[PDB]
Amino acid sequence: EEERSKVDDLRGTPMSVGTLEEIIDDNHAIVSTSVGSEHYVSILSFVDKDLLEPGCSVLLNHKVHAVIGVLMDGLDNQIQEIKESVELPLTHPEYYEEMGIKPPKGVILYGPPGTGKTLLAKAVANQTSATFLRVVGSDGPKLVRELFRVAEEHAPSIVFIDEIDGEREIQRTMLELLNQLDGFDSRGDVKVIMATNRIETLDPALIRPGRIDRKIEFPLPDEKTKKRIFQIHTSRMTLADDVTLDDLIMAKDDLSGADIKAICTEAGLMALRERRMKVTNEDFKKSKENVLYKKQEG
Amino acid sequence: RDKAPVQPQQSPAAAPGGTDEKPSGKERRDAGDKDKEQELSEEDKQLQDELYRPALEELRRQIRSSTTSMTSVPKPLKFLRPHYNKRFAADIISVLAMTMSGERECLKYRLVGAGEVAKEWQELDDAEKVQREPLLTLVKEIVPLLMEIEQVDMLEKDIDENAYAKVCLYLTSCVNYVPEPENSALLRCALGVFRKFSRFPEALRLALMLNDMELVEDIFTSCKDVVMLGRHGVFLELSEDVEEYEDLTEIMSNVQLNSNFLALARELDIMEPKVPDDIYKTHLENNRFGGSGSQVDSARMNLASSFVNGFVNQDKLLTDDGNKWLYKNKDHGMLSAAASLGMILLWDVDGGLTQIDKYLYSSEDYIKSGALLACGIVNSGVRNECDPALALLSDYVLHNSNTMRLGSIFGLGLAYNREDVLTLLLPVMGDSKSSMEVAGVTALACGMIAVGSCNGDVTSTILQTIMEKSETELKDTYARWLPLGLGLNHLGKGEAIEAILAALEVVSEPFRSFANTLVDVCAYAGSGNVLKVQQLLHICSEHFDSKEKEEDKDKKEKKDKDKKEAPADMGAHQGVAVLGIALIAMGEEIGAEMALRTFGHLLRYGEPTLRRAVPLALALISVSHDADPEVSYNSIFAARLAAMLRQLAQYHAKKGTLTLCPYHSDRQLMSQVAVAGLLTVLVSFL
Amino acid sequence: ILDSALLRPGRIDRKIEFPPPNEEARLDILKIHSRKMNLTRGINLRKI
């Protein structure tokens, strides 16, 4: 108790908040501040020194700066291949650990309809148990570096980038992104899934260096996975036997999760008109006509 | 219309005005009003005012039930004695009488403990049967008594939906909200309605819970009445515990008339479908056997290889690979290596004989002892090795037949109120050998024998075993493992006061008090209460770390069914073994992302006890996500315990008391290394 | 207004015509404005 309470001198009045840079094996660390002052002092107790994750804010003093502690702050054949790609370090391992490949260069997903429908369709399948990260959209790539290191800490998970599209800056930051994703100074960390619309707009430098494994063209709208999604959304809902999913999912073009959730919400809302707990096909189409006309009118 | 012209009509106390006003009010009683009925303050003077009067009582109870009250609402109805599919009907009846008779029955149940309210409750029951909307009247009638006759009066035409839903929700409430004493009547009424209905595997589950001898006879004569077979036989055997299966097999041995019940009594019928199917539809490679066989060394991982080769069984070649492997090893599993031949083969009775006989009456004692143990493990129905091990029971001071007693008695415990074996086990406990394993396997065997008993036994068994336990105090491990088997003997007691009776009978130091509170732990089957909750919160502050671990381990014994309340704040405390308590409390269940999240945090620790605690629970809860904590172990390490246990878990990867006993007794796993040979006798592993 | 019609290409709106100084609409609001300030009883608001 006394030896525990005798450290009150360091954590007392002469105390400040600094920022540590890195941990040295020489037992004298290096910190930083607004003016970037560095102080090397032998380590003390109360610090983890392992999970501390250097490069964050720490505790300093008006004294010699001895640290008393720290303060925290038709795609079936295609989809089975990407299954054996991203789900490879996951359930049903016995088709892997026998020999093994492990090409963590990531893959590239695209198609003619686009609008992230198939992309989110494949992305939501891995959302059962995992940590998901969605990045939409494309000074330097500082934020990209932050996402890279936070995905380096999030490495035991699945990272999914969506909607990948002066002008000369875009090319050089694309080269920088390519170099950073290539893992020059670092080994395999986290699987990165590239998702876009048109592959013709992307430069060839995003194909060969980026992914060394496989890339597959989009053969058709793939009404199957979409039927599965619709089944998931309508699982809590009710429907009759006269309602065909095929023509419905075939008619819809370029819809998102919020979109189908909206048209289902208005489907139930329009089914509330007659006060029925069951949604028919004609009511579903008639309800869909509202949103369909809504976005095309403006 | 406006209430203005009909407003003065209620003012006179004259009879004719009221009598011809009431039908109009009844006609407008459909919604009851177009307003909130603020007329109560005006008509309050009509309370004192009293043929057609019960209709006025109907109006009064109508408005009183229209606004609110905790008391006076049902009174005009019970004083009324009502006499003389539509919207009006459903309105003035369903919800109104639901809340009215609901609060009436509630208050009456919370006050007095008449026939009028009973008849009204039956009339309400019939009315709701006409309404045909279920589960509302059920969920309302959960707490309040008339149950059986009501439920059997409700079920006539419709069967599947009503039965399924009602029994499911009422059994869920039985294991959650509803207290223990109602479970008996619940299961009796359920027994009746399932006796009148089809789909045997419900009343079969009732035979699982009630543990009755006649029910299985009824389901068998019902199976003979209307005629898959082997499968229902399989989970019949899985459903039945020790007592009722012995009553079953004794009355069937008495008559049974079909010879097929004695064909079932010789067992082997549950065993036979498994092997050829496992050989055919499933396959395996030699890579695992080669790698895991070549990565073992230092006489410890070798024991791990004995465990692996023992519990791996399709491939019998590994056992026949090479020689001298058992020779290089010491007794330290040479015991488990001798028991390995018993662990690998659950079949081939005639083959098991010519497999074991080579190790029988050999030059080594532990080999033949482990061989007898193997003979006890291989077949639960043969029991022909009793007599030669029976005659050799008494060793006087010391001999090998003590270890033979271990193997044979424990094996018989795995095989099984039998009197002769008990009388022969009397000198066993009366001997009091310095070896802990003797009384350990004695308590385990007799424990697994005495499970499923009715209201336990207060007799000279527990009496003399308690007297001998209190004769002298040494090696507290005895006082640990004995209340295990004692609790196994006291398992399944509904009305028994034996917990309090024990709390009275024994008053002593923290040792036998630990034993007593262990008996207390094993005396609770569990039900909805705040009692064990406040008792838990109160005893959580106990200074003794052991009884803390045990009593807090009782948590996973209680709430195991519902995993929603399974996660706790125990892992967030400063306790060293408390995180281990929760770690074990994770359960044998599916081990979903939450459980995996807990194991992920509980994987890394500074103490070797916790590091040895995690892989066992992780392997028990899971049967690359499975190999992820394994690779994690490879990262942390690259000691010997870690390797042995991580391989043990590697091959561990790929309310029956039978599976309850082994791990509950394996919570004692921290101990001298001599128990490692007794670590592999767990029957909980399928 | 037309710019808002560009931002809202006939999606959700409620259109109400607002002619300046319509009349009968001038009288009452002129009275309202005449409530606060002091005004005599010998004045004719109609023609003005």
Side-chain angles (χ1 to χ4, degrees), chain B residues 286-547:
Chain B
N286 199 14
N287 296 324
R288 297 176 60 91
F289 300 91
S292 300
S294 64
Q295 69 200 12
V296 293
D297 205 346
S298 179
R300 201 175 194 89
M301 301 66 172
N302 189 15
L303 303 177
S305 180
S306 65
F307 192 92
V308 159
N309 192 15
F311 277 159
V312 68
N313 298 321
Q314 190 273 338
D315 190 18
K316 302 179 181 62
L317 181 130
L318 181 62
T319 68
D320 300 331
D321 280 334
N323 203 10
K324 296 182 182 297
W325 174 76
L326 190 144
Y327 180 79
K328 298 178 182 180
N329 197 347
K330 206 179 274 73
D331 302 333
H332 212 143
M334 250 183 303
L335 280 172
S336 301
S340 180
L341 296 183
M343 297 191 298
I344 57 175
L345 291 178
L346 195 58
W347 245 90
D348 298 337
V349 178
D350 300 331
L353 181 60
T354 190
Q355 284 296 328
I356 299 300
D357 66 343
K358 300 297 181 181
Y359 286 163
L360 290 181
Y361 51 86
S362 298
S363 299
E364 291 79 5
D365 47 339
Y366 291 88
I367 290 184
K368 69 179 68 178
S369 68
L372 264 300
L373 176 58
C375 292
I377 293 176
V378 283
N379 296 314
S380 298
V382 168
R383 68 184 178 271
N384 289 120
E385 300 295 334
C386 299
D387 31 336
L390 210 289
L392 296 179
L393 282 181
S394 62
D395 282 332
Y396 295 158
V397 41
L398 190 145
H399 202 259
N400 181 34
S401 300
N402 286 326
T403 59
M404 187 178 295
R405 175 187 293 177
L406 263 65
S408 303
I409 294 301
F410 189 83
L412 185 57
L414 299 177
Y416 287 161
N417 197 27
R418 197 73 276 176
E419 54 181 0
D420 59 346
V421 61
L422 202 153
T423 55
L424 266 298
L425 278 177
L426 189 144
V428 175
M429 187 60 64
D431 197 352
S432 179
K433 190 182 179 181
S434 298
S435 298
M436 174 59 207
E437 294 81 5
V438 178
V441 305
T442 306
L444 288 178
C446 77
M448 294 184 66
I449 288 174
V451 286
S453 298
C454 298
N455 300 320
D457 51 343
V458 208
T459 178
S460 62
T461 67
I462 69 160
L463 185 63
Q464 184 181 2
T465 206
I466 281 176
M467 290 180 179
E468 292 180 355
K469 179 181 179 297
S470 62
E471 180 181 1
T472 175
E473 293 79 6
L474 277 319
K475 197 66 174 64
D476 299 331
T477 312
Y478 288 94
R480 292 192 292 178
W481 292 9
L482 285 179
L484 266 294
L486 290 179
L488 295 175
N489 184 27
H490 289 300
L491 191 139
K493 48 181 180 301
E495 62 272 12
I497 326 292
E498 300 179 353
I500 309 300
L501 298 177
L504 294 176
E505 184 259 4
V506 50
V507 279
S508 65
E509 61 182 347
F511 292 164
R512 293 179 291 174
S513 299
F514 170 78
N516 189 18
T517 194
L518 251 289
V519 175
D520 188 19
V521 161
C522 297
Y524 283 157
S527 293
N529 44 12
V530 200
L531 190 145
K532 69 176 177 58
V533 179
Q534 65 181 357
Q535 181 181 1
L536 175 58
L537 293 178
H538 184 73
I539 205 63
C540 186
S541 61
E542 185 66 26
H543 185 272
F544 206 73
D545 299 331
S546 187
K547 60 178 62 178

Side-chain angles (χ1 to χ4, degrees), chain B residues 66-285:
Chain B
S66 179
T67 165
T68 186
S69 178
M70 62 298 297
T71 53
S72 299
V73 168
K75 188 259 181 181
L77 185 138
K78 68 179 180 62
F79 185 79
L80 208 161
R81 191 178 298 177
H83 198 60
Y84 313 100
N85 189 13
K86 297 181 272 71
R87 182 183 298 270
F88 173 79
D91 287 331
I92 70 114
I93 296 177
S94 299
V95 48
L96 293 185
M98 180 186 65
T99 305
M100 198 172 187
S101 179
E103 67 180 2
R104 170 53 66 188
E105 287 294 331
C106 181
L107 263 296
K108 285 297 182 181
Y109 185 79
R110 294 299 180 91
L111 182 60
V112 57
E116 299 179 355
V117 293
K119 295 180 182 297
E120 293 176 354
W121 193 76
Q122 293 178 357
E123 180 66 28
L124 178 61
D125 186 21
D126 190 18
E128 295 297 329
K129 283 177 61 178
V130 176
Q131 294 301 115
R132 297 183 66 258
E133 290 96 15
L135 188 147
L136 186 55
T137 72
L138 300 176
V139 77
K140 179 163 268 70
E141 78 185 0
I142 293 306
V143 33
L145 52 87
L146 279 68
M147 191 273 299
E148 179 182 1
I149 54 176
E150 171 265 324
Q151 292 191 5
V152 306
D153 192 19
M154 180 178 289
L155 274 302
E156 276 82 9
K157 180 62 179 63
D158 297 330
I159 300 176
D160 298 331
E161 297 180 354
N162 294 327
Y164 177 78
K166 178 182 65 63
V167 174
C168 180
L169 67 91
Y170 198 19
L171 192 273
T172 301
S173 66
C174 187
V175 80
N176 191 13
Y177 292 160
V178 173
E180 184 178 1
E182 193 171 358
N183 194 16
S184 299
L186 196 161
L187 263 36
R188 288 181 181 271
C189 182
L191 185 148
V193 298
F194 290 165
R195 174 62 270 175
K196 299 187 278 75
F197 290 161
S198 62
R199 194 61 182 270
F200 298 155
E202 46 190 2
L204 186 55
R205 185 179 296 271
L206 296 181
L208 166 62
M209 193 60 191
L210 279 174
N211 189 11
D212 184 79
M213 61 186 73
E214 299 176 355
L215 211 164
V216 59
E217 182 179 1
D218 299 331
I219 206 175
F220 282 166
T221 187
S222 297
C223 278
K224 290 301 296 179
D225 189 18
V226 178
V227 178
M228 296 180 294
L229 190 144
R231 187 176 300 271
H232 80 70
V234 161
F235 58 78
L236 180 272
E237 204 280 335
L238 291 179
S239 64
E240 61 185 1
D241 57 339
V242 180
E243 181 178 1
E244 71 180 357
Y245 119 91
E246 289 191 3
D247 298 333
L248 174 63
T249 194
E250 76 179 3
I251 186 63
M252 291 306 108
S253 70
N254 188 14
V255 187
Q256 90 189 16
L257 198 62
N258 202 16
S259 70
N260 292 324
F261 293 149
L262 271 181
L264 287 170
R266 197 172 292 101
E267 211 69 22
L268 275 301
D269 292 340
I270 184 174
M271 306 303 177
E272 59 91 12
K274 296 183 180 180
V275 177
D277 292 336
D278 290 330
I279 296 176
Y280 291 160
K281 70 183 295 182
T282 63
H283 303 86
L284 47 87
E285 209 67 25

Side-chain angles (χ1 to χ4, degrees), chain A residues 88-91 93 98 128-129, chain B residues 87 285 287-288 593 624-625 627:
Chain A
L88 192 62
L90 279 94
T91 62
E98 295 296 329
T128 60
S129 299
Chain B
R87 182 183 298 270
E285 209 67 25
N287 296 324
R288 297 176 60 91
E593 60 179 0
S624 298
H625 290 167

Side-chain angles (χ1 to χ4, degrees), chain A residues 237-238 260-280 283-284 286-288 290-291:
Chain A
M237 296 178 62
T238 58
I260 186 178
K261 183 179 296 297
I263 69 180
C264 286
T265 301
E266 75 188 354
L269 182 61
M270 201 63 191
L272 190 62
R273 302 297 302 272
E274 299 178 356
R275 296 181 296 177
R276 297 180 295 104
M277 60 183 65
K278 182 176 62 62
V279 177
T280 61
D283 184 83
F284 186 83
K286 180 169 58 63
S287 63
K288 177 61 177 61
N290 190 12
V291 163

Side-chain angles (χ1 to χ4, degrees), chain A residues 79-96 107 122-131 157-158 191 193, chain B residues 624-625:
Chain A
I79 201 176
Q80 67 184 1
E81 204 282 335
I82 196 176
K83 186 71 176 179
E84 200 70 18
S85 180
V86 302
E87 291 279 329
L88 192 62
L90 279 94
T91 62
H92 196 282
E94 58 267 19
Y95 284 159
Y96 170 71
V107 295
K122 295 190 168 179
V124 74
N126 300 323
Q127 292 181 357
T128 60
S129 299
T131 301
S157 301
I158 289 87
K191 295 296 296 181
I193 303 177
Chain B
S624 298
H625 290 167

